[PDB]
Amino acid sequence: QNITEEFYQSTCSAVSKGYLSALRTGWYTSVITIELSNIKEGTDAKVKLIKQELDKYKNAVTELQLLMQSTPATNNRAFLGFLLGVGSAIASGVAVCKVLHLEGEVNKIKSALLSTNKAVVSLSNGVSVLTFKVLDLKNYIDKQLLPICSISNIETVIEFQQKNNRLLEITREFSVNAGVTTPVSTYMLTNSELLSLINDMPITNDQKKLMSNNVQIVRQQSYSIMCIIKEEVLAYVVQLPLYGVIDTPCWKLHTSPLCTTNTKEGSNICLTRTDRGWYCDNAGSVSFFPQAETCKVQSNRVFCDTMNSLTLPSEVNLCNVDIFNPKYDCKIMTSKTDVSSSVITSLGAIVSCYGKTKCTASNKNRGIIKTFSNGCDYVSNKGVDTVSVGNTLYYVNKQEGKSLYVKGEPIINFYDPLVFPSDDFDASISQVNEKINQSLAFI
Amino acid sequence: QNITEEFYQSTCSAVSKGYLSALRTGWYTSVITIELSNIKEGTDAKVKLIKQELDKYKNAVTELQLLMQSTPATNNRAFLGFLLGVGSAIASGVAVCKVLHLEGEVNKIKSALLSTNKAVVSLSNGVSVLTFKVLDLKNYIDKQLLPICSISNIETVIEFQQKNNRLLEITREFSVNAGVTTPVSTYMLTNSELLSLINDMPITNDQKKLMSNNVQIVRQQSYSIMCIIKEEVLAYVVQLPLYGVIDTPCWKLHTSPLCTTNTKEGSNICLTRTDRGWYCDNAGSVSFFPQAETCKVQSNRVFCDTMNSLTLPSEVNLCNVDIFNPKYDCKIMTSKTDVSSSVITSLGAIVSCYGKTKCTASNKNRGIIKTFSNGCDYVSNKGVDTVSVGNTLYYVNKQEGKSLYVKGEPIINFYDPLVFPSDDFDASISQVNEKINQSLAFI
Amino acid sequence: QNITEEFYQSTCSAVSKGYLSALRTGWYTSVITIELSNIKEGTDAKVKLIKQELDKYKNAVTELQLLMQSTPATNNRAFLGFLLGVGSAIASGVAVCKVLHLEGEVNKIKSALLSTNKAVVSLSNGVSVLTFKVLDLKNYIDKQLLPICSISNIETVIEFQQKNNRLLEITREFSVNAGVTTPVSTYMLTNSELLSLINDMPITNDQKKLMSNNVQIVRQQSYSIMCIIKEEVLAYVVQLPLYGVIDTPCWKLHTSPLCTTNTKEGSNICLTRTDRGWYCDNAGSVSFFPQAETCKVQSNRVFCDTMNSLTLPSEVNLCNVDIFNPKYDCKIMTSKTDVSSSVITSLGAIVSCYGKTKCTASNKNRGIIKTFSNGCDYVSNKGVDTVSVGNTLYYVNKQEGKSLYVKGEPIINFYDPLVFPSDDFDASISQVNEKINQSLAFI
Numbered sequence A, B, C: 001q002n003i004t005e006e007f008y009q010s011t012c013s014a015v016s017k018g019y020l021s022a023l024r025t026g027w028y029t030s031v032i033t034i035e036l037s038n039i040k041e042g043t044d045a046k047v048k049l050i051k052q053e054l055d056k057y058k059n060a061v062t063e064l065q066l067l068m069q070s071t072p073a074t075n076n077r078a079f080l081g082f083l084l085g086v087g088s089a090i091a092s093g094v095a096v097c098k099v100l101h102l103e104g105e106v107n108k109i110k111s112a113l114l115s116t117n118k119a120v121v122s123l124s125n126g127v128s129v130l131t132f133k134v135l136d137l138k139n140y141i142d143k144q145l146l147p148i149c150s151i152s153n154i155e156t157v158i159e160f161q162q163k164n165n166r167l168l169e170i171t172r173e174f175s176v177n178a179g180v181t182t183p184v185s186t187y188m189l190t191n192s193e194l195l196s197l198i199n200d201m202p203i204t205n206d207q208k209k210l211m212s213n214n215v216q217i218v219r220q221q222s223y224s225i226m227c228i229i230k231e232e233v234l235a236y237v238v239q240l241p242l243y244g245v246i247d248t249p250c251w252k253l254h255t256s257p258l259c260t261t262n263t264k265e266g267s268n269i270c271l272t273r274t275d276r277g278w279y280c281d282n283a284g285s286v287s288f289f290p291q292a293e294t295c296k297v298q299s300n301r302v303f304c305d306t307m308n309s310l311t312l313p314s315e316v317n318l319c320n321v322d323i324f325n326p327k328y329d330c331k332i333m334t335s336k337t338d339v340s341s342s343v344i345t346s347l348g349a350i351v352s353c354y355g356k357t358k359c360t361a362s363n364k365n366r367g368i369i370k371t372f373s374n375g376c377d378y379v380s381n382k383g384v385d386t387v388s389v390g391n392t393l394y395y396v397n398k399q400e401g402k403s404l405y406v407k408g409e410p411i412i413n414f415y416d417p418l419v420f421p422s423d424d425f426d427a428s429i430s431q432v433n434e435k436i437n438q439s440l441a442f443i
């Protein structure tokens, strides 16, 4: 659609709006199965290759049984990303997998898939899961390999290597991942199977269209949890994202340090808005994502995970127009570190140029077209292809869109360096004012 | 076994105990070899496919020789994770690989594996390494391909593609990993080979049982170091973990911010125990792992790496019962950032609810069963399936175990906001008291 | 060459010099193509396997077309690594891929590769890109599969599975990577193709030699961007690194906390040089890399990316000899956290030993040879194989080189604990002096 951007000279920040939301709010767990064969069996070259591929099948099953001597688990914890909470990503999938170990539970799944490959099963604890038999190695081995150290053809040797290769690759992934994988590969769930799973999935037609048109993103936000091998059934849970928030406005906040440009070294004070990240309207509040690198962007669609978010009042948006607004305490950090750098935005580039640093913006066909002076400045991607700050070359995003340079005095000029609080990583406008008042009292 | 949990209302923290240790304390280096063939050789379709697979073999060897023009190296450095030291993970493996470049050293290995595939070799510097020949491409090429632009069969074309595929995949992994890979794949070392390596390994019967029952974890903590190609031998060092600490008590500390709940904005002070992470008794002290996500958990067994640990006095455990104890200076951080979030624990969930945030705990079959008020609170996973804080849904771990809610006044109530030190990421109880005393002196 | 190291007892730091630079300063974008076939077509076992592999070809094309419904994008942001700027890594490649969607542009590439596989094409916006047709599936399908539900041979079934496997694997990588991959695999660009691309690349003979001898590093610093499928052409952009800075001196700075060793707990003050990382002379300044783990090291050659760098005055090197020099304000952090740890350097080990921690250096053949006392100390890798601090065992790098122990009084002794500022993560020598002067004024 229409991506736009506004740069705020007063606070050394830029906001890119025009994006639409696609937020991971929940999980849907499906049970993928592979029906196994339980077999016990002079020789020629064609049969020797079959027995070789057959031992790869036996060892793969043995390896997966050895891998599941314990509850499946992943690694769990105990700018503002350090403010986020701590979830357990696969807790819902592990719970479903715990149910499959109850006796008779696997038999319910084995029975529902006897006449078809797609089925919805209600488990003993009342959870409605979608079940899927993607490979019937039982039917192949018992009907195309059991008739054989007897006669054989090589068209069978090849077809068995093709059909067994999926189980071998699924085992490889689970082996180097301790039974939990993300993203979900095409061996765990092919593109045809995933699209079929999304269509038979119980969701809105909006969610189906969104997931089908972005299967690569659905893969990156899914988990494959190796579950159980019991009664000739190989089952692993695939945990798929639910997008409960769709098509709400999103905007990306880019920030860079704002410093004074005095010549005498050590006299300079700096200030940086710390609330950078993705923002999306969500249920009367704003879902704020401090680590924007956790969100995936596809054109104007933004895919984030609410586990990596804070829920803030919508008044946080006021910090972009008036950082001194009386309704929200805008978060900033203070420092005396005036180092030069640049932040590439959606439609331009913020340049924090200080000291003796050479800062330019160039075009590919003409070279330098603008030389930045000391301070925090901005250039749009129209006519500009590269930005240089020191020895670092930045390419700018060449996506179409309009920028707006909002002129304003840098707020760092309003502060007396003698009473400026420094080394505050987690501060705000009011906290700095409160500390300056305490220092001015002692003077 | 028996996992239990205690929540401390006074300090907004929870401790999960009942776990057993499995700590990576050292390394064992083994030398895996692949015996190569040194060959120089109208045509039909079956031979054409053999010559195609033969050039894949030549290019794989050429590619691995080009990759080892230099010493193998990985990337090295120069809540409390920033306190950890800096190791060189593959320093022991690289040292062993440096020895294999000394002349006559590879010949010692080539000779020991002439009659068998398992052998222990004493190297020139006196290191006892386990040597393993996993693929003899020399024997296959010289006996099944050298007899051939002559007659041929397709059962050979297939068997050569199968046997050569391992060298092709080992080359692929080393190519996109600069010769150092982790975890160690099934191409580097199959499950049968790894288990065989662990059994012939010189360790306790306890370590063998532990490694064999958790090969997937052993893979994730191992490195494969591409070493040398000399005299028809392809050697790469596999660096396997040593678990010198086993079956000692472990417990996981979860912490969340504790803030005052005053209505006037900006008047609230916060406090967070920063010593969260995994703790395991280890040789009279406690091995503390500040980034719990570096540890892998299998049922009640906890796999950590001592490189990611601090060695602390056992009195650090006193911070869970009495954070004001006179024997250990409990680490905390101070802030005025009262944002809402939740921390999912082993057997429940800590909820830090502040401001206007909607915080609930729900059951799948009935919906909301508890609404949290402002402050830091806790709920156990019995009867609870989800926790919601703002727009973020958390699933709780559904593992069996008993929780205990230890009531106590939040220690944040004991502090005067007028003299409260703020923005201290690396503080402690005594440091805060020392700073408050200095502020009270000036008043 | 000659790697050397100096340890500074005064500031608990060590500098390793003797390295040569190889800095990623720019990007070169090439367009890799795969010519596709557009086909629409009782049966036997050999043909059935062909139709099975043919549907894998159709589904792979359909999957890649479904993947490119949107602009390709990656994840972007919005000790001193938090000072770095924010780039858009694939902005140059995405720009080139945007040009290929203009009409007639793909036809220009399709035409230039009709008679050869290597070609340089000038695009409509005037960018000179290197074009490469690596797979002609059109020529194979239209000439070896179109003659066929008729007669067939199995030597064709095998050759088709071999030739189609590359497209299947390229699709797999793009599927689990949202169309952007790094490092660039051997399926995206084989070793023969990459070396050929580097030779036909327009660069210095120095850059060609450097890239050819370190293709594994070039792979790790490259991106493969899935671009377009139009008019029987499968095109993806490969973004290759440009090394504009080569063979300048580099040195690695290792730092560890320096604390007082008083016996009464809580009275100790600590100080840590925060400017650790890689340093390379670059165009009159110094390119400083605060997160040394982002640089890859091959023997004495150091591969870094200027996007992960700050451009500093060369006087920053003065902090190693005289941390109180009047020309550069050396960056330090202050704390009261006196925890023990070690930092493994290039040629030795720094040991910060405090409290009751057992700190030793050992040899493999004799055990402990040195016991560290409280403070910050150092040992070289000559005669030393392991260092132990608490329950953590460190192996030291066994590379050849000379160390120099520069004796000096620890600067932490020069500070009065009563007026020592604490919890300053982003401080400097002058900022600490400025704060001590303010505290001494109030006293």
Ligand SMILES: *[C@@H]1O[C@H](CO)[C@@H](O)[C@H](O)[C@H]1NC(C)=O
Residues within 6 Å of the ligand: A433, A434, A436, A437
């Ligand atoms: C605190 O500081 C602000 C601005 O610096 C000022 O407007 C306000 O009056 C001060 N309050 C007190 C109590 O000093």
Ligand SMILES: *[C@@H]1O[C@H](CO)[C@@H](O)[C@H](O)[C@H]1NC(C)=O
Residues within 6 Å of the ligand: B433, B434, B436, B437
């Ligand atoms: C320091 O503060 C603590 C508690 O705030 C108090 O018990 C102690 O007496 C104080 N010491 C001094 C020297 O002020």
Ligand SMILES: *[C@@H]1O[C@H](CO)[C@@H](O)[C@H](O)[C@H]1NC(C)=O
Residues within 6 Å of the ligand: C433, C434, C436, C437
């Ligand atoms: C600041 O401190 C330094 C050293 O602590 C001293 O040399 C200098 O004179 C002080 N300056 C002032 C204005 O107090």
